Amino acid sequence: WEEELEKFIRYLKENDLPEEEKEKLVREFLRKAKENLNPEELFKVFLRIINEVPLPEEFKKKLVEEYFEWAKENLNPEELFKVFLRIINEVPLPEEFKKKLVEEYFEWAKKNLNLDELKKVFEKILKEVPIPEEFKEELKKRYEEYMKKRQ
């Protein structure tokens, strides 16, 4: 549906629309593609909207939380981790909010992965997710406290 979104991005851009009406239309499109697209195609559209459409920054944060919430509801562990990495790397987000996504996904991994999958996923986060080393130490300590509770 790349032609459907191309006509949609041109549709919103070609009119001086108020923020609220532009927000409901971005939501309604990301929800129509949420019910019609697979998560890979849905993310390709998701990047073009945040990038191109002039939205408030807090609304960019909101779209990331809404799409990541659905991503925690209709995605297998592998494709959710791929979507999570591309949000961190390709979506322009503040660092504190990126930390919030890492902790948000870290809680999802606790609820949906065994100890080996959580172990492999955790190592890929410390190696590929751009987070401060002080935050990496805090995550490594939270991970230790969680592993001690297993025993």
Side-chain angles (χ1 to χ4, degrees), residues 2 5 8-9 11-12 17-30 32-34 36-40 42-43 45-46 48-61 63-77 79-133 135-139 141-151:
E2 191 175 354
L5 73 94
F8 178 75
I9 297 178
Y11 161 80
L12 293 188
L17 301 179
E19 293 185 356
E20 185 175 12
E21 294 299 324
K22 189 188 300 180
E23 283 180 5
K24 182 195 170 184
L25 282 163
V26 167
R27 286 172 179 268
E28 188 175 352
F29 187 93
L30 292 172
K32 184 174 184 176
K34 169 169 150 175
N36 295 329
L37 301 187
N38 48 44
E40 179 180 354
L42 177 54
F43 183 80
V45 193
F46 178 77
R48 287 193 56 181
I49 292 187
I50 294 196
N51 183 356
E52 305 175 21
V53 183
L55 299 168
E57 180 64 31
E58 192 58 48
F59 185 66
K60 288 184 179 180
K61 298 180 179 181
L63 293 181
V64 172
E65 293 171 2
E66 296 164 35
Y67 172 72
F68 194 64
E69 185 64 30
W70 169 88
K72 294 177 298 174
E73 295 173 8
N74 297 87
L75 266 175
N76 54 37
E79 299 163 348
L80 173 63
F81 180 68
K82 282 188 175 181
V83 163
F84 163 72
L85 276 180
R86 299 185 61 186
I87 295 178
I88 293 291
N89 291 328
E90 311 176 22
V91 179
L93 290 179
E95 180 51 40
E96 296 305 306
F97 185 81
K98 289 183 179 180
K99 295 180 180 179
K100 191 261 180 175
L101 294 177
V102 180
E103 296 173 338
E104 180 175 343
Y105 172 79
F106 181 51
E107 295 304 316
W108 180 94
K110 289 170 165 166
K111 302 174 182 178
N112 301 110
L113 305 182
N114 52 40
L115 289 181
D116 295 312
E117 279 182 325
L118 176 79
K119 203 171 189 172
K120 295 184 173 186
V121 163
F122 181 77
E123 300 149 25
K124 292 186 177 183
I125 296 175
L126 302 191
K127 185 170 187 175
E128 308 185 30
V129 174
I131 46 180
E133 191 63 35
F135 183 69
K136 287 182 175 179
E137 179 184 4
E138 176 184 345
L139 285 191
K141 293 304 183 299
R142 298 184 58 205
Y143 171 84
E144 285 179 346
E145 300 169 344
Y146 178 82
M147 293 295 298
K148 290 184 181 182
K149 293 162 180 51
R150 310 303 100 181
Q151 316 140 10

